[PDB]
Amino acid sequence: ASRHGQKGTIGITYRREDMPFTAEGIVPDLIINPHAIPSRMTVAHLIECLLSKVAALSGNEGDASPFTDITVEGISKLLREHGYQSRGFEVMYNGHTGKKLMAQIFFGPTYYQRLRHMVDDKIHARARGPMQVLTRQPVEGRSRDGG
Amino acid sequence: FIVEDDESLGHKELKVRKGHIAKLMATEYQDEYTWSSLLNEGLVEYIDAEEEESILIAMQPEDLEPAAKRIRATTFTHCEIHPSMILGVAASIIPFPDHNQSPRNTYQSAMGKQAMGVFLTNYNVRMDTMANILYYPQKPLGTTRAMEYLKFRELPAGQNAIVAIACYSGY
Amino acid sequence: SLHKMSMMAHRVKVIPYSTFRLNLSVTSPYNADFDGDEMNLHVPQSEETRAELSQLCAVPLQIVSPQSNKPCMGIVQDTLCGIRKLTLRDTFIELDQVLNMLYWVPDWDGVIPTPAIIKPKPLWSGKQILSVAIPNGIHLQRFDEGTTLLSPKDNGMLIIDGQIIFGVVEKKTVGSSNGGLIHVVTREKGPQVCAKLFGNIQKVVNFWLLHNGFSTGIGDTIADGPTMREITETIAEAKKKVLDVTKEAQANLLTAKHGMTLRESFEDNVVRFLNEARDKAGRLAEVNLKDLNNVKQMVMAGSKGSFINIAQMSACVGQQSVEGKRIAFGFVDRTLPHFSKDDYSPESKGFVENSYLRGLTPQEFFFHAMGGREGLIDTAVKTAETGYIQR
Amino acid sequence: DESAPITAEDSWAVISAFFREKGLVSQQLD
Amino acid sequence: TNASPFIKRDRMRRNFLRMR
Amino acid sequence: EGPQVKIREASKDNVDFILSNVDLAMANSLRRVMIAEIPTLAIDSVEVETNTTVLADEFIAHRLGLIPLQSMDIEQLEYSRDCFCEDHCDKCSVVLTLQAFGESESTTNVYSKDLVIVSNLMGRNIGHPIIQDKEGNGVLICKLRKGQELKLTCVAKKGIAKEHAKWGPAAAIEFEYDPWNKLKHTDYWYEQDSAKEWPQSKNCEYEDPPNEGDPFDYKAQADTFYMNVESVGSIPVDQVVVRGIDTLQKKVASILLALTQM
Amino acid sequence: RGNLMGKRVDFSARTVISGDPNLELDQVGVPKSIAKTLTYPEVVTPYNIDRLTQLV
Amino acid sequence: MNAPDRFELFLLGEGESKLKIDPDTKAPNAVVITFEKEDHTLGNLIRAELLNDRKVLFAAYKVEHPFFARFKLRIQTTEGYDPKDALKNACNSIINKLGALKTNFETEWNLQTLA
Amino acid sequence: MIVPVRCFSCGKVVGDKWESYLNLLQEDELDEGTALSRLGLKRYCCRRMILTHVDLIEKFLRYNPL
Amino acid sequence: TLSHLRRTNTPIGRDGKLAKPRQLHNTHWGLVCPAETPEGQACGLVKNL
Amino acid sequence: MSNTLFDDIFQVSEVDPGRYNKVCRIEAASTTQDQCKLTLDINVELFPVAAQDSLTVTIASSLNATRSWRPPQAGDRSLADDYDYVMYGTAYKFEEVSKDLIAVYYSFGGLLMRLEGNYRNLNNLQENAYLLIRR
Ligand SMILES: [Zn+2]
Ligand SMILES: [Zn+2]
Secondary structure (H helix, E strand, O other): OOOOOOOOOOOOOOOHHHOOEEOOOOOOOEEEOHHHOOOOOOHHHHHHHHHHHHHHHHOOOOOOOOOOOOOHHHHHHHHHHOOOOOOOEEOEEOOOOOOEOOOOEEOEEEEOOOEOOOHHHOOEEEOOOOEOOOOOOEOOOOOOOOO | OEEEOOEOOEOOEEOOOHHHHHHHHHHHHHOOOOHHHHHOOOOOOOOOOOHHHOOOEEOOOOOOOOOOOOOOOOOOOEEOOOHHHHOOOHHHOOOOHHHOOHHHHHHHHHHHHHEOEOOOOHHHOOOOOOOOEOOOOEOOOOOOOHHHHOOOOOOOOOOEEEEEEEOOOOO | OOOOOOOOEOEEEEEOOOOOEEOHHHHHHHOOOOOOOEOOEEOOOOHHHHHHHHHHOEHHHHOEOOOOOOEOOOOOHHHHHHHHHHOOOOOOEOHHHHHHHHHHOOOOOOOOOOOOEEOOOEEEOHHHHHOOOOOOOOEEEOOOOOOOOOOOOOOOOEEEOOEEEEOOOOHHHHOOOOOOHHHHHHHHOOOOHHHHHHHHHHHHHHHHHHOOOOEOOHHHHOOOHHHHHHHHHHHHHHHHHHHHHHHHHHOOOOOOOOOOOHHHHHHHHHHHHHHHHHHHHHHHHHHHOOOOOHHHHHHHOOOOOOHHHHHHHHOOOEEOOOOOOOOOOOEOOEOOOOOOOOOOOHHHHOEEOOOOOOOOOHHHHHHHHHHHHHHHHHHHHHHHHHHHHHO | OOOOOOOHHHHHHHHHHHHHHHOOOHHHHO | OOOOOOOOOHHHHHHHHHHO | OOOOEEEEEEOOOEEEEEEOOOOHHHHHHHHHHHHHOOEOOEEEEEEEEEEOOOOOHHHHHHHHOOOOEEEOOOOOOOOOOOOOOOOOOOOOOEEEEEEEEOOOOOOEEEEHHHOEEOOOOOOOOEEEEOOOOOOOOOOEEEEEOOOOEEEEEEEEEOOEOOOOHHHOOOOOEEEEOOOOOOOOOOOOOOOOOHHHHOOOOOOOOOOOOOOOOOOOOOOOOOOOEEEEEEOOOOOOHHHHHHHHHHHHHHHHHHHHHHHHHO | OOOOOOOOOOOEEEOEOOEOOOOOOOEEEEEHHHHHHOOOOOOOOOOOHHHHHHHO | OOOOOHHHHOOOOOOOOOEEEEEOOOOOOEEEEEEEOOOHHHHHHHHHHHHHOOOEEEEEEEOOOOOOOEEEEEEEEOOOOOHHHHHHHHHHHHHHHHHHHHHHHHHHHHHHOOO | OOOOOOOOOOOOOOOOOHHHHHHHHHOOOOOHHHHHHHHOOOOOOOHHHHHHEOOOHHHHHOOOOO | OHHHHOOEEOOOOOOOOOOOOOOOOHHHOOOOOOOOOOOOOOOOOEEOO | OOOOOOEEEEEEEEEEOOOOOOEEEEEEEEOOOOOOEEEEEEEOOOOOOOOOOEEEEEOOOOOOOOOOOOOOOOOOOOOOOOOOEEEOEEEEEEEEEOOOEEEEEEEEOOEEEEEOOOOOOOOOOOOEEOOEEEO
C-alpha cells in the first residue's frame, strides 16, 4: 500500500526484458492500473510522485508539509528545467516488441510499505482431518488444521 | 502564540520576536532557552478547550497582521503556531494530506499501523513473539516536517519504488 | 453471501504459484476486489452432486440475474476502456497486428477478412476486427439522440450479422444493460456461447491494449488558465448573491417563504445558490476539457469516474454537509474559533470553495473531515441493522 | 534587527524547542 | 517569489554566527 | 554486406552506437538477449563456518551473491548441471573463502577485495572480484568491532540472468528510434503544443527535421536505431555485445538443427 | 444456529484471489498445493482402469 | 507440495522434444508449432522475418500464459511450398543477417580503438 | 543496514560508492546533488538509493556483544 | 508504537444515537486528530491526541 | 465480367474535419447529373482533399464468391485498380425518397457513405462492393 490508502497485491511478476521500458532504460519496479485514480480521488498520490521525481533529480529531498504554498506549477517548472516533460509524462516502449507505445504514460518514484497480511499465513485447506470432541465436527483453527 | 494589542509600531503584533527565535536556534546548536524559559515571560500560552469561547485566533502570522496558486478582522489575541499541528501521529505521515479526500486519509491512518520496517534497535536482543524487520529500509523521498520530530527519518517504514500508472494488459 | 450468486460453480485448471485465480468479468457478482479478499472452495464428493452442481450452479447459465432481469455480468474497467479506444472511427490496424489478434481469437475460422482499405495500403478498422469475436446472426439497434442513419456523432449502435456497421462500443452496449449485447446473445443463441464471447472479447482487447498503452496523471487534472479565471469569477458572483441575500435578511425585509420559517428560507436560498455555483463551474471545466484527457476518456468510456469527480478534482469541492444543514455553531455563535461571532458567509460556515488541485485551507480541511466522518458512521450502523433484517 | 516580526517559516524552531522539552509521552510520565 | 520547495538550516547557523 | 554499424563513442564501461539496415524485431530481440541470456559466473552457495556479527546470515549470503566476478574465460568451464562430476569439481566451479576479524579498536570494514580464490584456477582468467574505484576497496560487505568473526566458504557456478538477477551483466540499456516521430508511432499528449511541451531528443540532430508540410510518408519503415549498452563490469562491453549476438544465433541454429533432426 | 443450521465442513480451501484475463468464466485457477491436499473418489470401471492404475 | 521453480523456465524438454509439428484442420497447408522454454525474444523475431518473406500467407505467434514458457506459432502458405521449408529458410536468413552484423561490429570496434 | 549492492531497478553496483559519497560531504563541503553527479550516477533510478538509504548498521553496532 | 501510546477511549453502551459522540465535533479542533479513527464499532469512540 | 457498376464525376462542395485526426467528411455533387448527391468519409491522411476538387468515383462489385484475402500479388492486374484510393465495404440500407430518388447507405469498416439519383433505379445496387477514387 501507498501512503494514500491504495492497498493492493501483486498479480504476477515479470523480468525486465518484457517489462515496459523508457528511453533512458529506467525499467519500472511496479505498475498499477489507472482506474484506481479517479474514483478514489487520490490526487496527493500523483503530486507526491511528481515531487519525488524532481527531488531525486535535484538531490534535494522533497517536502510535503500540508498547509504550505507549494504548487504543482512550481514543481512543473522546476522539473522542466531539469529536462523532462512538464507533467511527468514519458515516451515508453513495449518491452515485448520494442515498438513505441501510443499514449505517453506517467512515471516516477513513489514511497510504499509492505503490509503484514502475507499469503503464506492465509492459505489453508483440509480434507478429512482431526475432529472435535463435544460436537464431533471438524475443529477450528487454521494453525490447528481446521475446516 | 500570544498577541499583544498596542504596539509602538502602530497596529498589532505577536509578542515573540526574531531575537528570541535566534536565541532559540543558538540554544539548539549549542548541543539555555527552553520551552519553559520561553513560557516564563509571556510569549506562549496554554489554552484549554474552553477559552476558545473567549478568544480569537489567526492562521498565519501574517494573515491579517499587516493592515493562479490558491485562494486564501483586527482584534486578534492569539495566533496559532502552525496549522499542520492539528494532525495526529499517523496522519502526520501522509504527504500533502490537504490534497485528497478525507476518508482516504482515514484508511491510510488505519493501514499504517499494519506496516513493517524496524521498530527498535535492540531487536537483536529482545526475544519477542512476532517481529518483522525488512532489509533495506529507506527514508521517503517526499516528507513533511512532523516526521522529523517523529524520528521517522531515522526509522523508516518502507522502501520507495519506481512506479508507472499504466494498464499493461493483464494483471 | 447475500443473493443467489456467490455460490457459483467452476471448472478447475490447476496453476502454480499458490493463490486462486479467476476471470475479471465474474468479479462483480462475487462483489470482490483484489484488495486482499478471500474466497472459499467446496469439492463435491459423488456423481449426483457433481452433476447437479454442474447443471445448476455453473456460471454460464446464470448470466441473467433473476433478481433484476438484466445480466449481472459484463466486461469491466480495462477492457471497457480498451474497447472504446479500439472502436473509434479514427483508428486503424495494420497487417501484422491484425494477424496476431486473429490468432488470439481462439475459434477463429482461418479466413482473414478483406481490409476496409486497399488504399495504397492494407488497413483494418477496429470495428472490423472486433466483429470477428462477435458470432454470426446477431442484430441490434440503439438510435439515441443523434443517429440519422448517417451517424455524425458516431453514437448509437448497429450490428448486421455479427459485423459492426457503425457506433462506438460503450457500456450502453457491452456492459450490463437491458438491451445489451450480452442479454441478446444469451437469450438468442444459447446461454453458454456467451462464455466464449467474454473469452474472445477479453483476449483481443487486452492484446491490443497491451500494444497501445493507456495511462493518466496530473496533467489530466489541471485545467486551462482562462477557464480557471471564469471558474473564479463564477464563484465570486455566487458569493455576491449570497451577500446580497444576507443584507436583505439583516435589513428584516424578506418574503418569508411559505411553509418555512425565516431562517429556513435563508438557509434554503444560500444552499441553492452554492450548489448551483458548483454545478456551473463543473460543467464549465468539463466542456473545456480536451478530448485527449484520459479521465475524460474513462468517464465517457463507461467504467470509472464521474462528472462530480471531475468537478471536484479540478473546479470546486462545494459546500460540506452535516445532515442537510451546513456546519452548525458548535462553539457559541461561531463555527470554529478563527472568526468573529455571528457570521453566515459561506467560507465561515463551511463552503469549501477551493479544489483538490489547489488543496484546502485548514478550516475547509476540517469541514471536509466532518462530512467524511458522517458517512463512515452511517455505514457502520446501517450494515448491522440491514444484516439483522435480512436474516 | 532582533525585534522584527516572524515569518511563518520560522515557527518550526519553536516546535523543536517544545518537543525537545516535553517529549511525546510526557502526559503519561507526568 | 521563490516558493521554497526544500529545506535549509546551516545558512542561518552561520548567519547568527556572524550576527553574534 | 547488411546491417551496418556506427560507433558514436566508447569507454571502459559503456558503448553507444548506431544500428542501421535492420528490422525492429531484430533490434528488440538483440536487446532482450543482451539483458537476459548472457552466461557468466557468480557466487551461488555459501557455508557459514562461523558468524558473530550483528549483520544477519542470510544478508551475508544474499549480499555475497551480488558481487560481480571476473568472467572473461567463462566459456572454458561448463555448467554444474551438465557436468560429469558431482559436488563442484574444478572443471565446473570455483571456490571462494573469506576471513574477517575485529582487530582494531575502531570499526573494521570487510571489502570485496578480501575474499580470495582457493581452488585450482587452471590458468583461466576467472573469479577475481572487480575493483571499479581507484582506492582498492571492492564493494562493502560488512562491519565489525573487536570481537566479531566471519569464516565463509563460497562456491560460484555458471548461471544465466534469466533465472536470477545475480547472473546479469546488463545493468542498464537504452533504445530509441525515430526521434522526430516521423513514423507516427505515437502522438503527444499536450495542452498547447506538442513541440513546446516536450523536450527535444538528444538524438534529434542525427536525422533531419521533418521539413514541415510534406505529406505523411506512409510507405516508410523503422530503421536507424540508437543503442547505449552499459555493463556492470563483470565482463567488457564489446564482449557483452558480441556474446549476445553469438548466443542469439546459437539459439536460432539450435532450433534449426532440432527441426532438421525431426 | 451453530451446529445444525450451519456447521464446519470438510473438503474445503481458502486463499486470496487475483485477476486473470487468460481464464474463461467457468474456469478457476487452483494452486498445485491445494489440489494435492484435496481429493475426490472415483469408482473403478472398465473404462478408467488403466488411467487409475497409472495414477495410483 | 509441487509448485514449480525457475529450473523449468528455460531448461529444454526433459524426456521431451523441443517442438511439436501438429497439422491444422481448418485451412489448407497450415501447421501449428509449439516451442517451449522460449518466449517473445525468439518468437517475435521468427514471426517478423517469416512475414517479411513473401511466399507465406499467415504467420502469428502467441504465448498462452506468462506462467508457462511455451508459445505457439501458425504458418500457412500457398501450395507446393512447404511450411517447414519456409521456417528453415527463415532461420537461415536470420543466421546470415546477424552473422554479418557480428563481423561488422568487430571491424568497427577494432577501428574505434585508436591505432 | 549497509548500502544495497546493485540498484534494484537498474543493476549497477552501488556500495563501492558509499563511503566516497560520505567524504564528499565531510571535508569537501560539497552540495550533495553535485556530489552524486561527480560520483557519476546520471540515471536517477540508481540515484535514489544513495540519496535515501539510511545507515542503521552502526547504530546497531554500538552495542557490546560478547 | 507512538500512535498507540497517545490514545484515548470512551464507553457509550449498547447501540447509541447519531449526533451523540460518534460524529466529530467543532470543539475537537486542535486537540484530537480529525483524520485517524478505526472504522467499525469504534469510529468516533477511539481517538488520538 | 465484373465491370464498373456505377461511375461518375463528383465536385466536392467542401470538407468537414469531423473533429477527428485522420478521417473527415466530404460531400459532393455530380457534374453531369444535377440531382445525384454524395457524402463520404476519407482517411484524409492518405488522400488529402479540399474544396473545389473534381473526384471520380467507381463502385466496382469485384476485380477481374470470395476467398480469404491475399497480399496483393505484384503481377499485372486487369482490374479496377489503376486508381489512387481503393476501399472495400458493404451496403446496409435502401431508401425511397420523393418517389423517384433512391438512396443507399454503404458501410466501410466504420466509414459511411451515401448516394442519390433516379435513373439507374435497377442498375444501381446488391449487397457489397469496392470503391475506387482517382486523383
Ligand atoms: Zn563439475
Ligand atoms: Zn539504478
